[PDB]
Design a protein around this nucleic acid. Structure first.
Ligand SMILES: [K+]
Ligand SMILES: [K+]
Ligand SMILES: [K+]
Ligand SMILES: [Mg+2]
Ligand SMILES: [Mg+2]
Ligand SMILES: [Mg+2]
Ligand SMILES: [Mg+2]
Ligand SMILES: [Mg+2]
Ligand SMILES: [Mg+2]
Ligand SMILES: [Mg+2]
Ligand SMILES: [Mg+2]
Ligand SMILES: [Mg+2]
Ligand SMILES: [Zn+2]
Lengths: 225, 132, 343, 103
RNA sequence: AUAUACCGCCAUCUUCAGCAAACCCUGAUGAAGGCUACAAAGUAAGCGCAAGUACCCACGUAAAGACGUUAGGUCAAGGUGUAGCCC
């Protein structure tokens, strides 16, 4: 009797709005351009499945079309915010050691999880053995870098799909986005780009958790009276 | 490869007791002796006779309490007293354990011409030390 | 001598000879192995050949409120006890010989087609009672090792399905066959395909594919046609829930390539709703049983095109000589269209 | 006298349920391709063969033109054709009686 | 009689460090394979080594030394399956 009203006012109401958390105010094509998000790798490193997202090559350096990044980033931030609102477990994954410390801190600050270390075989597909039969896996995996340190796709991209976990991922021009649920074409190398991504996801997640408490609190006060 | 008194590794499903899990080189190091008497001390006599008596009592008790013994017997000799300490299961009715204690103590006292006492410790199931 | 006697465990371990050089590499052509029998099973403590009645051990301690005294059964009364113990023993032997009858699969000695039951319930109280498991192949594979030489293992292929479109298959490997069965069936439920069925009885369209060297040609069929397909395809189709289909397997007939090809073909079929949405046209079904009545089976969810589909006077589609040879009455096979049991 | 009653009793429902009486029958034969004719008869001089057909194995099943619920089990519901004998495994003797009762 | 039916107790590599349940992943779900630390699919109970213990130390020497290998040795230690002998 009271559960259907709960799930309808709290869980289903945010899903009826195009931008319930107003994540479009967090970034702009200019803000992305200043963070050097459009800068990709040289043409010789281009991955075939990234051609649709490439604006062009400027003297053999691929340029990422920020008009597409803006639309893909909007979807990724929106999805990420909704998953944080629903109290989903968000796991950040990246092997880029220059940003391991930054990413681990961003996860702790937003109240989420980070895995920036060597990824051991079976963390996801064999989690019950490694952690226990009652272990809860992540509801969303966010890749700030989709490649490992030998320039291959991070094993968790394949294993996240095997476990039917949606993935958000920054995909540079040398990355393979086929299995990434919400790919975001963008520069993954420059500290300005990576720092921006961490600010955006951190802000999206922090806002969505605060929104969940506001809605719940209002739903309770009105319930008593 | 040495075989003597070694329970060999299996698939991890074979329960062994503490007595069974220790090879002979652990005797006096990790496991004690199952019979204690003075016959094997320096300058003491009748070790052969104590050994025959011990072999009989172990066979005798195995068949007198069939399916009830959960571990090896502990044999203690003090003076002319003989104490038999056995760990048994809790399947047989207590009336049968009292019958067999009275029967065994009396029969063994007349056989070896010494006061024999039987001490029973009951356990719900065989105590498992490890699964080999 | 009393002192030369051993325990039953020692006597059976020796007599059975389960461990030995003969068991190591199956060095002997042997069939019927001695089986250990527990000789203390029906034995009562206190009962002996002489028939003595010991109060408190084999007879009640108190009778009519008084302690019983030592007594001995009469010769006649003891003969009955011995006979009753033999009959009790014969019943134990008789029943053990008697067995329940295994339902056979594709042949009497084959594992293929035999059900393994539902997969085991998962650790988190997950259950698969709705799923049935079928064996497709049991193979003895061998590897050569430095020490042990020719080593024997079991490779098992099983398929699982709930009969409502959800089905999968997995390979199982182990030294023992029952362990291979457990691994295969439990793994398959984590690799399930969903197979779309037209009217929940057949496929949506003819499927012709090659997987490696195995060719599989499947034809959509009407109700009542049954499963006229390779026996393994019949087994898999019952797990999916397909009742009416024709299939012909050509080329290499490999069970794993046939199973993997089958699931690929069935997973990659276009439904009528998908066809309508892709082309923005109505999908109209014509049945000779229903005459010229046009039956719309699928309509596009989005806008409906106004331009008719181009009518190519002659289609440039590739034809199978087998289908053409049959439609022309030129395919003459004594083995085709034979009467068979309901499948 | 009233053969249609057996199909409405509890004994029938426990033995066959909602499946046809021939659902669980399997012919014993060598090879993968069975003989194109079933056995001539399962009852020979009042003696029954070891693997009697679906009709002959249950003496309470009476092939009669009034027991239409049994006859329906040997006709295709979608095409109305009478199954050939190897389809259900009925002996040639009973398949003729079924075909005559159906007609 | 049969150690080529075995228990039991052993030789041998071993003056070795490997064996391996249960999972997971790779190979198009083939026999099979599974590592790189500025790490790239393995996690591994248990067994052995190791550690502890004995002898005069923490050294040395003993002891220990898995799974398997040689149908290795022993039916004549004892027990025992099968077959055979019973004036
Ligand atoms: K031996
Ligand atoms: K011997
Ligand atoms: K012998
Ligand atoms: Mg990059
Ligand atoms: Mg040695
Ligand atoms: Mg032979
Ligand atoms: Mg047979
Ligand atoms: Mg030998
Ligand atoms: Mg030392
Ligand atoms: Mg030594
Ligand atoms: Mg050591
Ligand atoms: Mg030899
Ligand atoms: Zn018949």
């Amino acid at each position: 009797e009271d559960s259907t009203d709960f799930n309808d006012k709290i869980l289903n109401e945010p899903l009826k709005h195009s931008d319930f958390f107003n994540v479009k105010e967090l970034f702009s094509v200019r803000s992305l351009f200043d963070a050097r998000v459009h800068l990709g790798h040289k043409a010789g490193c281009r991955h075939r499945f990234m051609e649709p997202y490439i604006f062009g090559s400027r003297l053999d350096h691929d340029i990422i079309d920020l008009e597409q990044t803006a639309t893909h980033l909007q979807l990724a931030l929106n999805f990420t915010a909704h998953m944080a609102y629903r109290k989903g477990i968000i796991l950040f994954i990246s092997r880029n050691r220059q940003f391991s410390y930054l990413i681990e801190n961003m996860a702790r600050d937003c109240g989420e999880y980070a895995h920036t270390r060597y990824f051991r075989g079976g963390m996801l597909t064999n989690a019950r053995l490694l952690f226990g039969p009652t272990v809860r896996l992540p509801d969303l995996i966010i890749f700030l870098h989709t490649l490992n340190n030998i320039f291959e796709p991070h094993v968790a991209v394949r294993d996240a799909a095997k476990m039917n976990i949606p993935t958000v991922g920054i995909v540079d021009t040398n990355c393979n986005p086929c299995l990434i649920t919400y790919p975001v074409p963008g520069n993954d190398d420059s500290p300005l780009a990576v720092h921006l991504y961490c600010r955006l996801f951190q802000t999206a997640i922090t806002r969505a958790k605060e929104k969940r408490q506001q809605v719940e609190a209002l739903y309770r006060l009105q319930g008593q009276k | 490869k040495n075989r003597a008194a070694r329970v060999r590794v299996s698939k991890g499903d074979k329960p062994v007791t503490y007595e069974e899990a220790h090879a002979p080189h652990y005797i006096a190091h990790r496991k004690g002796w199952l019979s204690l008497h003075t016959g094997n001390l320096d300058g003491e006599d009748h070790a052969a006779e104590r050994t025959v008596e011990d072999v009989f009592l172990r066979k005798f008790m195995w068949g007198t309490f069939p399916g009830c013994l959960a571990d090896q017997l502990v044999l203690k000799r003090r003076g002319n007293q003989l104490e038999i300490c056995a760990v048994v299961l809790r399947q047989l009715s207590p009336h049968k354990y009292y019958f067999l204690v009275g029967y065994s103590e009396t029969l063994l006292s007349y056989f070896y011409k010494c006061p024999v006492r039987l001490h029973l410790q009951t356990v719900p199931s065989k105590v498992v030390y490890k699964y080999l | 001598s009393f002192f030369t006697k051993l325990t039953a465990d020692e006597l059976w371990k020796g007599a059975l000879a389960e461990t030995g050089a003969g068991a190591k590499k199956g060095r002997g052509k042997r069939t019927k192995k001695k089986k250990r029998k527990d000789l203390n099973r029906g034995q009562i403590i206190g009962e002996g050949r002489y028939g003595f009645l010991w109060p408190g051990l084999n007879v009640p301690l108190m009778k009519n409120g008084a302690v019983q005294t030592i007594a001995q059964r009469s010769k006649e009364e003891q003969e009955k006890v011995e006979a009753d113990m033999i009959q009790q023993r014969e019943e134990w032997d008789r029943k053990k010989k008697m067995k329940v009858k295994r339902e056979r699969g594709w042949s009497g000695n084959s594992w293929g087609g035999i059900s393994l039951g539902p997969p085991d319930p998962g650790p988190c109280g997950e259950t698969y009672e709705d799923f049935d498991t079928r064996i497709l192949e049991v193979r003895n594979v061998f590897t050569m090792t430095a020490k042990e030489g020719r080593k024997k293992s079991i490779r098992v292929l099983v398929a699982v399905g709930n009969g409502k479109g959800a089905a999968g298959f997995s390979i199982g490997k182990a030294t023992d066959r029952m362990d291979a069965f457990r691994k295969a069936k439990n793994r398959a439920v984590h690799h399930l395909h969903y197979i779309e069925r037209y009217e929940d009885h057949t496929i949506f369209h003819d499927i012709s594919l090659r997987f490696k060297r195995t060719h599989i040609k499947m034809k959509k069929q009407p109700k009542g046609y049954g499963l006229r397909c390779h026996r393994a395809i019949i087994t898999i189709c019952r797990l999916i829930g397909i009742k009416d289909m024709y299939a012909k397997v050509s080329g290499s007939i490999n069970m794993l390539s046939l199973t993997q090809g089958l699931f690929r073909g069935l997973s990659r079929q276009e439904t009528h709703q998908q066809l309508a949405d892709k082309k923005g046209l109505h999908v109209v079904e014509i049945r000779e049983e229903c005459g010229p009545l046009p039956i719309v089976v699928a309509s596009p969810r989005g806008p409906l095109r106004k331009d008719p589909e181009p009518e190519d006077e002659v289609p440039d589609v590739k034809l199978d000589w087998e289908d053409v040879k049959t439609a022309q009455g030129m395919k003459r096979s004594v083995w085709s269209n034979l009467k068979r049991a309901a499948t | 006298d009233e053969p249609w009653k057996y199909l409405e009793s509890e004994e029938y429902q426990e033995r066959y349920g909602s499946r046809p009486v021939w659902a669980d029958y399997r012919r014993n034969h060598k090879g993968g391709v069975p003989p194109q004719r079933t056995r001539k008869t399962c009852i020979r001089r009042n003696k029954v063969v070891g693997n009697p057909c679906p009709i002959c194995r249950d003496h309470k099943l009476h092939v009669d033109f009034r027991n239409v619920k049994l006859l329906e089990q040997f006709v295709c519901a979608h095409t109305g054709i009478i199954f050939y004998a190897p389809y259900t495994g009925v002996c040639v003797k009973q398949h003729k009686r079924l075909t005559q009762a159906i007609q």
